[PDB]
Design a protein around this ligand. Structure first.
Ligand SMILES: CCCCCCCCCCCCCCCC(=O)O
Ligand SMILES: CCCCCCCCCCCCC(=O)O
Ligand SMILES: CCCCCCCC(=O)O
Ligand SMILES: [Mg+2]
Length: 278
């Protein structure tokens, strides 16, 4: 049948100069860590030590500067525009917040994305955005973010946003969080661990089984962080939609092997990231 569109996602893309570095290696999407200040305002794109094996953990930007950089990379006509870059996952490091600041964090995130990435709707960046929350109890972040875009008069930008819960929670617990949040679509499900440690496919398989079921709630599944060809083959064989990596050219190489090329292709802006593949 049709080839499954795949997001090849550059990992830990936290400096503006890295956006081109990863896209030029074959990434059509990136993941970026977002730190918060004491007031739940996104502050830096910063991970810190420890991080993935082989990487510098300390590159960072003021979050709004990173957004302006991402805006340039994703706005047609800009000197820096990368047509290939279609999705950003923000790994929201809400662990530094109290649980009762989750909703505030979502409003401040929306406020900054509207201002600096979507340019108040004036020729904004065009990538789809996934808000990845590490703790199921921080689900009120989603409400906060939607309510802020609505207050600011741009509720339609929610069409460009989707959701993930990154903490490797049991799939039924994740679904219960989305039911609490009133969310029923635009759901990605991460599964993974640092490239420094081993991991199997059992939870990826559970997530894929949910995605492919008639009654499931997941739209896309992505596996992280994968730096080896054999792991990439295993994940594609398991039917994931996305693979996060420190080496986009490694994943591109596998996808260009003749057996995989018949069955997968690199996602473009044509491909809606909230739609389950069939
Ligand atoms: C930066 C303010 C933008 C507007 C934010 C609207 C939602 C505010 C939620 C309560 C935030 C309380 C802490 C405010 C910290 C600050 O920005 O000075
Ligand atoms: C399984 C984890 C889901 C998130 C925890 C949210 C807090 C639970 C209580 C929220 C209100 C109860 C409800 O709406 O059923
Ligand atoms: C949040 C989606 C999954 C992202 C993996 C990034 C890991 C990290 O920052 O340690
Ligand atoms: Mg991260």
């Amino acid at each position: 049948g049709n080839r499954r569109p795949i997001w090849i996602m550059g990992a830990m893309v936290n400096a503006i100069g890295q956006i081109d570095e990863f896209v030029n290696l074959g990434a059509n999407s990136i993941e970026t860590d977002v730190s918060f200040d004491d007031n739940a305002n996104p502050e830096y794109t910063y991970h810190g030590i420890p991080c993935d094996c082989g990487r510098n953990c300390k590159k960072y930007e003021n979050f709004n500067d990173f957004l302006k950089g991402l805006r340039s990379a994703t706005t047609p006509g800009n000197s820096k525009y990368q047509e290939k870059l279609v999705l950003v996952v923000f790994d929201l490091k809400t662990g530094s917040l109290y649980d009762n600041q989750a909703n505030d964090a979502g409003k401040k995130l929306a406020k900054n994305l509207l201002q600096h990435y979507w340019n108040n709707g004036n020729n904004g960046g065009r990538a789809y955005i996934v808000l990845s929350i590490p703790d199921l109890n921080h689900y009120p972040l989603i409400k906060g973010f939607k309510d802020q875009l609505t207050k600011d008069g741009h509720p339609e930008l929610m069409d460009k946003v989707g959701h993930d819960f990154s903490g490797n929670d049991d799939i039924g617990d994740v679904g219960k969080a989305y039911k609490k949040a009133g969310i029923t679509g635009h759901i990605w499900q991460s599964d993974g661990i640092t490239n420094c440690l081993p991991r199997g496919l059992s939870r990826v398989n559970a997530a894929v089984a949910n995605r492919d079921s008639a009654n499931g709630f997941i739209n896309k599944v992505y596996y992280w962080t994968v730096d080896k060809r054999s792991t990439t083959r295993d994940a594609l064989d398991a039917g994931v939609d996305g693979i996060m990596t420190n080496y986009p050219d490694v994943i591109t190489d596998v996808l260009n092997e003749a057996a995989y090329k018949k069955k997968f292709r690199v996602a473009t802006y044509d491909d809606n990231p909230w739609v389950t593949f069939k």
